[PDB]
Design a protein around this ligand. Structure first.
Ligand SMILES: Cc1cc2nc3c(=O)[nH]c(=O)nc-3n(C[C@H](O)[C@H](O)[C@H](O)COP(=O)(O)OP(=O)(O)OC[C@H]3O[C@@H](n4cnc5c(N)ncnc54)[C@H](O)[C@@H]3O)c2cc1C
Ligand SMILES: Cc1cc2nc3c(=O)[nH]c(=O)nc-3n(C[C@H](O)[C@H](O)[C@H](O)COP(=O)(O)OP(=O)(O)OC[C@H]3O[C@@H](n4cnc5c(N)ncnc54)[C@H](O)[C@@H]3O)c2cc1C
Ligand SMILES: Cc1cc2nc3c(=O)[nH]c(=O)nc-3n(C[C@H](O)[C@H](O)[C@H](O)COP(=O)(O)OP(=O)(O)OC[C@H]3O[C@@H](n4cnc5c(N)ncnc54)[C@H](O)[C@@H]3O)c2cc1C
Ligand SMILES: Cc1cc2nc3c(=O)[nH]c(=O)nc-3n(C[C@H](O)[C@H](O)[C@H](O)COP(=O)(O)OP(=O)(O)OC[C@H]3O[C@@H](n4cnc5c(N)ncnc54)[C@H](O)[C@@H]3O)c2cc1C
Lengths: 364, 363, 363, 364
């Protein structure tokens, strides 16, 4: 460990990893501190859908940033693979947003006008995925709402960063950021470090730093419980989606299935009721999944915010301190765009101003 | 691995392990052959309740079960002395819950028994305050205890080993040959002579029956299970209802099961099966919703035409014995099964009702 | 989660769990906060030997260790009654082997002790025939037993819970604030007042010392371990030598360790470390070569400047107590640690030598 | 389960799976029986090196068949991915066959003349892999000795086969093959099945069937113990090889490390001495591996034969019965060629005759 770095990233989930990579690409002398292991928390629980077309939202700055981050994924695997040897495991099968009611059709067809989205009838869906529940009314088909394996996106980024010269310290919690001196300094159990810039990327645990730094931004965990099966019997290429729940086909023959929404619950292992409700929901979407062998079960804490958007930007009173946290259901999608934005801000480059405003810290 | 043994045991689940111990205890130069690892199959999937009181009619089967339940009395200490292995015995007891009047009536027929009592809703809820508030009371059975089946199995085999028995894991027996003055079996590592052969291969035993001119068939009844951590509530007694159960282990885990899928040979749980085990558990113990899941698993109960095991001699050849088909009660029945098979080999006198009830040629 | 507790315990390893039980036993309205899961850290990685006889000099530390070893006497039954959790106690005892004359000499200095005897090569090999044939004999210590540390931890916490203590997993404490008429701590889920705060955060305790104007430092000494299945040989006693050990569990597993890597904060084993644990084990028990590996793991021993824990009051503030830095002996010391912290809070009189040896301001 | 199939494959390792796929491609009504799960035995233990240039052998029929099977891998992933959704996880990093002595150099340079093999000096190796042991004398570099994940090759094949119409029955041991009737029939615990052709592909357990069928072909298990680490710190693209031991970099950042040779040992979990010796050997090849975190440990039974080559072909007295078993250290490499050969023989196509002879059952 050195005394000084030009930039310091606090937290080693996917968000922190992207930032570290993107700073090291700019040849900034960078260090990242992580409590446990890289990707060991909410990043590991994640399904890895790169879904910008959710929750079929309004067309705002949040959506453009999503579409943009989705674009940045196009050569990302190849880019990071060349430097890290780590494959992010990209699957380009696409997505069916299923409908089970007339009200479902109606709401989904409010997107048909986007060029990426077309509408399929009951018959047209089943032509492509015969095992989709027979009770469906049709589906929104999205070509670009693909997926990746979040753990490995995280490992590709951090490995790539190391190779570009970044310093990674696992098992090193940051206890405090200060704040007063000419330079910033951070305290660890292995002693202190000085920095020209500090990025807080500690997901749902980021409140500590906000408060240490005179800010009242709070985070609310929303726990999500998932499970996986082995699909040894059925063809399934497209991700099936309904009402925030999903069945995601992996390149291994596993299906990733989720998920519960449990606000205020900080626990990181599934309880019995959670898994039960996930299993019940999955069968309505793909009946054949009931005969599939269970593989793993797990949970993770989505980092919730008061308005549901992340905080990505400078401390309103100190340009040296940045935050990148609060990616609720979409931290995997947004990881590259978050990483690029943070890096550009630190380099004093000019950034999209709608994005700066949307994810600013001081939102009154 | 020798050329000859006095006795060969084929299969190292709880049953085969037991037989081998009783044989070794009698100074019979004994070998055991197991395809995989000791206890690695159905034995591993079992909850380990010693429940004889399962009513319906009190026949030969019932006596044998009660006799075996008695045999578990000093077993733990006995095997621990020889093996260093704890069978993890738990003396809490069992409540067989009632959810209807029909339930109450059927359970009250065991009342005459000394080991059984009826409890009312209010009396059950004093003892287990977290049992479902929908219960109409429960049959309490103080002596229907539980063990950890894997460790009973490991205890026995390690004991037999200390008594001289030779154990061969990763050694499938391919054929038993009956023709000559002595028996022999075939394995991939060579062929071994024997004076007695015991077939203890659980649901896979059919292979050998057929080889030896008998048409005895086994049907697997797959059972899926899960465990949760009970970190929050007191629960001393096993809860039971309609063949499902919640069993508190001395680790703080709860063992919960089980499905019943006949004709399925798969040994890992399906999603639908695990879903129904969770549904059922919640009806017995509502708080189970909020307990963190630990593990999920499955195994194959060895079913037979009439529900009863085959324990005894080949009707044409007293050198050959079978010990397979302990449906929902293989753990309970293992000590008595072991002692019976051993006694028969040794030509001792045995209960002739038990001999008749578990015989090979039935119709 | 309430606004106020009489006592708050920060950390749920074996130590914090113990403290919480003793506090709850005294009817103190008690809360415990743990970052992860109860016992999920160093406590989980510990072998669980109760070894006080570790010579060198017999000081205050030694008495305390012996006192704690006495406290384990009815503990298992005591905690089982309240919790339903078995601490998995094993009374086999320990051989501290000798491989040289230097070895013999150093070990023979404990001879005067009543709980200790010397055995010759031939006497050790009668008892444990598989111990290395290179031994020059061993110090036998009948009462240096072992437990399963995770379950001692779970036993205590579940007991405290049954006595009224409120437990909060997944709840890191971020700050202790000292300024006002009463203490408070800060958590992500809100802030809580307290009359006493106990810091029991193992190797991570430094955070709090600093916050509270004290410069006490912790150095982790990582220890890597493995387990094998002993399916083939008798082994009742623990084997010990030069801080490495082989411990037989009542499951049939052997627990083997350990490395000593100071300044390493990683909690999973490296390859080099596991290689050296295997090398060492084989020198003590050659047959271990042929035993199938089960698991490998690691944890961080909480080291201090002088090797001793800090157990006691903030020298400036009697509302604040510390219980951290039990280097190689946190499991052994947990009952006495729990009773000491509890007694201090309750203002009872305590051994003043022990109070002095484990005090916070040392130099 | 049906009464009759045109062909029946006994055993569901990689060999059996390839055969099932290749028969189903020819639209033969096919069934495969497996005791446990697909790929659950020796196929799962395997490293997945597709190495034809071992043990730097003589240039014979065995070698050509290997080179050929290696060629068949070129579009195999894409071929099977289109039908199964399962990625075989192909890595094209290549191989260094390291030398630690003058005798090592000498023996390795007996291959320089092959166009696929060039020689690197100590310096040239370290230029590419700085972490290779400094005690090396140089290395044979092989561009095409790539690798795959054997479990998934096996799953891709079996899934592809199902889609082509094949019937897969896991948890169904074959008890007996007979033999006498007009048609062949096999006995399972779920009852009997008739077949026009029977393929024995039961790896190291195949002796049973040879003997049931009047043949004395024996198999000797050679147990192999392996472990994996996480390489989070070091660049490593090339497989390192020395004296039958190996460090294989996976696309996940794991390194696969092996292996012991234990003849006559039928056990399928590592013992302590085995793993110790694997760890000791690995450090001499890549010193930095000693600081790497352990992940998994496992073992498998190589299916040995009297002469070290497999048996791939017809029963010398019955054209309806075939065997494909005894791929010692190279079943993953040879899986496609074995599958193609068996299928062609069953279809009475004309096959390479040197290959037929080399792997014939009756080798006196
Ligand atoms: C079941 C589930 C499914 C999901 N599926 C998707 C999906 O399909 N697509 C999608 O885009 N998103 C998904 N998400 C959301 C996604 O997981 C999150 O938005 C994202 O992982 C947040 O990334 P992060 O790096 O901010 O958080 P984390 O991965 O939680 O990382 C934060 C890191 O900071 C570390 N840290 C905390 N405190 C400190 C400290 N004091 N010092 C040092 N380090 C510290 C933590 O240890 C942690 O490793 C899902 C979430 C769940 C729960
Ligand atoms: C309280 C209680 C709870 C129970 N719960 C369950 C439950 O939840 N689920 C359930 O399924 N059952 C349950 N059971 C009962 C079940 O009967 C036992 O779990 C099981 O019967 C053990 O019987 P076994 O030793 O005959 O079979 P197994 O344990 O299956 O052992 C047979 C052994 O034979 C070996 N073998 C087979 N063929 C060969 C061969 N050719 N050569 C060499 N070896 C061979 C196999 O490898 C296997 O290890 C329960 C029983 C009780 C009493
Ligand atoms: C026979 C024997 C064998 C042993 N073997 C080993 C061994 O092999 N390896 C080894 O490493 N040690 C070993 N030990 C001894 C070791 O001292 C114990 O394993 C350990 O000390 C338990 O101590 P603890 O409860 O203080 O720490 P831990 O078990 O580490 O518990 C501290 C807890 O505090 C929590 N925490 C930390 N910070 C916060 C916060 N800010 N807010 C809330 N919670 C927090 C952590 O989550 C952690 O769970 C052994 C001891 C004995 C007696
Ligand atoms: C540590 C190790 C590393 C290796 N690395 C490599 C490598 O890098 N490259 C390479 O090319 N090779 C490697 N190998 C070799 C390779 O694993 C084998 O050559 C290959 O897997 C053999 O394939 P198989 O399908 O014949 O055998 P298996 O995968 O063993 O399959 C045989 C199947 O038949 C089934 N079966 C058995 N009996 C019956 C029955 N009676 N009824 C029904 N089914 C039955 C079994 O259950 C099993 O699933 C390695 C081996 C080991 C042990």
């Amino acid at each position: 460990m050195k005394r000084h770095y030009e930039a310091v990233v606090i937290g080693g989930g996917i968000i922190g990893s992207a930032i570290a990579y993107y700073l090291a690409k700019e040849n900034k002398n960078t260090a990242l501190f992580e409590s446990g292991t890289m990707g060991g928390r909410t990043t590991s629980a994640a399904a890895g859908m790169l879904s910008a077309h959710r929750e079929c939202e309004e067309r705002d700055a949040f959506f453009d940033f999503a579409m943009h981050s989705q674009r940045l994924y196009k050569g990302l695997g190849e880019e990071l693979y060349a430097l890290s040897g780590v494959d992010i495991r990209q699957h380009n099968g696409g997505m069916f947003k299923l409908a089970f009611s007339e009200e479902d059709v109606l709401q989904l067809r409010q997107m048909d006008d986007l060029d990426s989205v077309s509408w399929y009838s009951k018959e047209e869906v089943l032509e492509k995925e015969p095992y989709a529940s027979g009770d469906i009314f049709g589906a929104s088909f999205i070509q670009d709402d693909v997926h990746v394996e979040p753990y490995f996106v995280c490992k590709a980024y951090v490995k790539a960063a190391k190779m570009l010269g970044a310093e990674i310290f696992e098992h090193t919690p940051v206890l405090h950021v200060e704040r007063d001196g000419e330079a910033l300094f951070i305290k660890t159990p292995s002693g202190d470090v000085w920095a020209n810039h500090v990025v807080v990327a500690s997901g749902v645990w980021s409140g500590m730093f906000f408060k240490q730094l005179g800010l009242n931004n709070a985070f609310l965990p929303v726990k999500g419980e998932c499970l996986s099966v082995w699909n040894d019997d059925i063809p399934l290429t497209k991700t099936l989606y309904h009402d925030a729940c999903y069945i995601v086909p992996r390149k291994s023959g596993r299906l990733v299935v989720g998920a519960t929404m449990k606000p205020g619950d900080w626990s990181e292992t599934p309880d019995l009721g959670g898994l039960e409700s996930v299993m019940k929901k999955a069968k309505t979407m793909l009946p054949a999944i009931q005969n599939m062998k269970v593989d793993r079960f797990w949970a993770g804490l989505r980092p919730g915010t008061k308005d549901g958007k992340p905080y990505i930007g400078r401390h309103p009173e100190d340009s040296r301190i940045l935050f990148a946290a609060g990616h609720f259901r979409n931290g995997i999608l947004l990881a590259p765009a978050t990483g690029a934005l943070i890096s550009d801000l630190i380099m004093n480059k000019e950034v999209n101003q709608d994005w700066l405003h949307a994810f600013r810290i001081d939102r009154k």
